[PDB]
Design a protein around this ligand. Structure first.
Ligand code: YNC
Ligand code: CL
Ligand code: CL
Ligand code: MG
Length: 384
């Protein structure tokens, strides 16, 4: 029935727009007319502005998400974004502290809800629009189905609109009105025995343990020999190589040089970017971020260490060769599995590089924007 969503400027479930339509649902917005009062919470609850740069505030967000954030459809894994990852994800160029919004239960002073956004220029069907990218919506497990999520969404919408920003981008596994694109995850096992043991992968009479280990074995030699960790000197180069690649897609972030430094410069256990420099030019790049899952009630392993593909571009090798190198670099950094969405060129390598299809998919959404939807190979943005 979507009783909340059908109040909002998003498409109905059966809306179909053709390529001649690429504009807002609601235009001519004025900051002057945005509500200046905070949305009302149920009695006993209060808004709290989180300071993500403060270690203690950040640890409170970390705890809320560790305990209550997204699980796989089978409730076997729960994402466990690290505190240093959250610091990176939320303090991008020009971020607003006041879009990092928490809800405390007053009687215990405990954070029980959170939602966040950061600002970025998004190009959709060649039109570039300032958007908020919304993420980390989370309601404590003990307070589910009480309609707190619409309150957090309406309050962040209000605060984003105060900055004269009227569109947003967000992804989710749940189906909501209405995806602009839909992309499955695929996974490439690295630490095969651990993935078996925790119930992530399986074996059969044809695929014995030893045969599975051999199937997923990787040669410890790079196809692109000079791939090395990115440094500050490489920011102009990555800005040109990635910037030029992305222009072909129907949906992508238009990164400034400051944004390139922020999103790609390596941070241990958070973001890994490797470059190939030839003649003072950056000609290939690989990048992947760290997102572990807590393995729910497992005796042996508490954590699945997963690398998620971010942005990969080659001009000196094949895409296959580049992605075989990304799996190698993730292996050299202790990751158990390399995951990727069927966006950009990724699906073209999945068969040959022995990826498995994951369950369900990730839906891409715009708020207050009507346009044609498209196949996920035309998506050129990866959100965290
Ligand atoms: C400018 C501008 C606009 C700015 C705003 C743009 C819109 C942004 C939307 C939010 C985007 C979120 C992106 C993500 O971060 S992804 C990960 C979501 N994090 C989890 O998966 C963690 C585990 N899970 C939870 O923590 C809770 O289940 C949630 C997700 C907070 C939902 O809370 P609960 O207690 O279930 O549900 P209640 O409070 O009764 O709310 C029901 C209404 O809510 C809608 N809803 C549910 N999940 C949603 C969701 N994931 N995103 C958006 N809406 C969602 C839903 O359909 C329904 O509304 P209807 O009646 O159907 O029209
Ligand atoms: Cl009022
Ligand atoms: Cl090597
Ligand atoms: Mg609720």
């Amino acid at each position: 029935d979507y009783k909340f969503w059908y109040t909002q400027p998003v498409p109905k479930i059966n809306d179909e727009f053709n390529e001649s339509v690429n504009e807002p649902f609601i235009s001519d917005n004025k900051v002057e007319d945005v509500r200046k009062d905070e949305y009302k919470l149920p009695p006993g609850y209060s808004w709290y502005v989180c300071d993500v740069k403060d270690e203690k505030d950040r640890s409170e967000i970390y705890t809320l998400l560790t305990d209550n954030y997204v699980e796989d459809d089978d409730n076997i894994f729960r994402f466990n974004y690290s505190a240093e990852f959250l610091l990176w994800a939320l303090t991008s160029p020009n971020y607003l502290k006041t879009w990092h919004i928490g809800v405390k239960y007053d009687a215990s002073n405990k954070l029980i809800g959170f939602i966040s956004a950061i600002p970025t220029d998004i190009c959709i069907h060649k039109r570039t629009i300032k958007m908020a990218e919304v993420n980390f919506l989370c309601v404590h497990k003990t307070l589910r189905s009480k309609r707190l999520a619409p309150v957090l969404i309406k309050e962040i919408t209000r605060r984003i609109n105060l900055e004269n920003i009227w569109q947003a981008i967000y992804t989710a596994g749940v189906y909501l009105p209405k995806p602009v694109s839909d992309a499955r995850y695929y996974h490439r096992s690295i630490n095969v025995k651990k993935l078996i043991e925790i119930g992530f992968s399986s074996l059969n009479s044809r695929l014995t343990m030893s045969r599975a280990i051999k199937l997923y074995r990787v040669e410890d030699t790079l196809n692109i020999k000079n791939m090395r960790l990115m440094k500050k000197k490489d920011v102009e180069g990555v800005h040109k190589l990635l910037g030029s690649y992305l222009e072909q897609f129907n949906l992508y972030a238009v990164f400034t040089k400051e944004e390139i430094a922020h999103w790609f410069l390596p941070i241990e256990n958070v973001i890994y970017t490797y470059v190939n420099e030839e003649n003072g030019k950056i000609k290939d790049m690989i990048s992947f971020y760290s997102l572990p899952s807590q393995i729910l009630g497992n005796d042996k392993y508490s954590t699945l260490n997963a690398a998620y593909s971010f942005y990969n571009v080659t001009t000196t090798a094949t895409f296959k060769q580049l992605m075989q190198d990304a799996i190698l670099l993730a292996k050299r950094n202790n990751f158990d599995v390399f995951n990727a969405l069927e966006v950009m060129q990724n699906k073209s390598v999945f068969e040959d590089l022995k990826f498995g299809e994951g369950d369900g998919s990730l839906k891409y959404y715009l708020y207050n924007w009507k346009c044609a939807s498209f196949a996920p190979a035309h998506v050129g943005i990866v959100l965290l």
